[PDB]
Amino acid sequence: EIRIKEIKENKLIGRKEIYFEIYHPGEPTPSRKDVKGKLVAMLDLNPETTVIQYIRSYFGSYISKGYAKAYDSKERMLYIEPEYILIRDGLIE
Amino acid sequence: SQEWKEYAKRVLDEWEPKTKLGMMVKEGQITDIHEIFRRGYQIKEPEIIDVLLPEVNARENQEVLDIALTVRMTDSGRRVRFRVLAAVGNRDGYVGLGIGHGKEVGIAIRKAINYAKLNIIEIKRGCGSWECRCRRPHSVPFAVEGKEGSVRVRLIPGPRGLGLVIGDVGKKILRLAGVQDVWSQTFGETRTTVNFAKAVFNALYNTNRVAISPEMIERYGIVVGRA
């Protein structure tokens, strides 16, 4: 289960910032791909234009914070976003 | 408490009054202990006080401070003698100090406690610190200075719950005096226990010497003896 607090649009970059919380009481930490496929469903985003950087689960906490970015075109990430979070997300080999 | 009343009645039965002060404390027109102090009679019979203040006989209300072992000596030997310094007192502002000579430990103990009973005095208490101001007689009402031999002692009021920061001799003497917090400064040789104890005693007695207007009696909750 993932529930959102922050949905903020940066129009100078034309990009959407999503701060969300994952409820994982008693089960191992969810992976990048699972939440990546989870948010895109009810936020209705293009998977390739959407990237996640960090998902921090605190000590002794079942609710973990996470931040994702949602771009519009295939060149915005190649220009602005750094090269790591394409590789970590598999967008670049 | 009731046990103390029982002991008071027992001694009232047994004791027969010798000194002039004996009658009106046996006859019963004196019940306040401070009746003895205010007028300024003399006390010589140990039975006078335990009738009004039987609590002295408690083991927690009597303390043996030191056991000195002095030596006279002659051509045909060194003849020893015991000098025991011990204190007695209720924890509501009436304490006495005593020194007893003897040839055995118990003899000196008994004589010391008996003489300490005669050294009973009345202790003003209050709250004169710059931080407490609680108007409860938990400490000295004002800073005081006592002198005996070389030793000088300054007792300064202190805040509640600080404890007695003073040498163990003054610690015991004040603990039996119903005082809980005080700053202490000691000038001179404090290794000699006897002079230190006597100086603490004299300082406590000197507390009553300071002239006080009623305004500070309210301001510090000054109690003359029992609170």
Binding site: - | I36, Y205, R226
Partner: protein, 60 residues
């Protein structure tokens, strides 16, 4: 807890209070014979004069 507020006596000659083990004295007035005159040890030793509160009689 009853606070038994006693009246500590005060000397007449000087006005100083009487500490417990002072060798002070208390005696009836020398001329009106009803007023109680206290005399503290310090007042006693040098024998400074005292005055009655009632009749204003002077007496060492």
């Amino acid at each position: 807890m009853v606070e038994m507020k006693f009246e500590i006596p005060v000397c007449t000659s000087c006005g100083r209070e009487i500490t417990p083990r002072e060798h002070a004295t208390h005696f009836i007035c020398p001329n009106c014979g009803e007023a109680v005159i206290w005399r503290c040890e310090s007042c006693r030793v040098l024998a400074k004069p005292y005055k009655c509160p009632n009749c204003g009689w002077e007496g060492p």
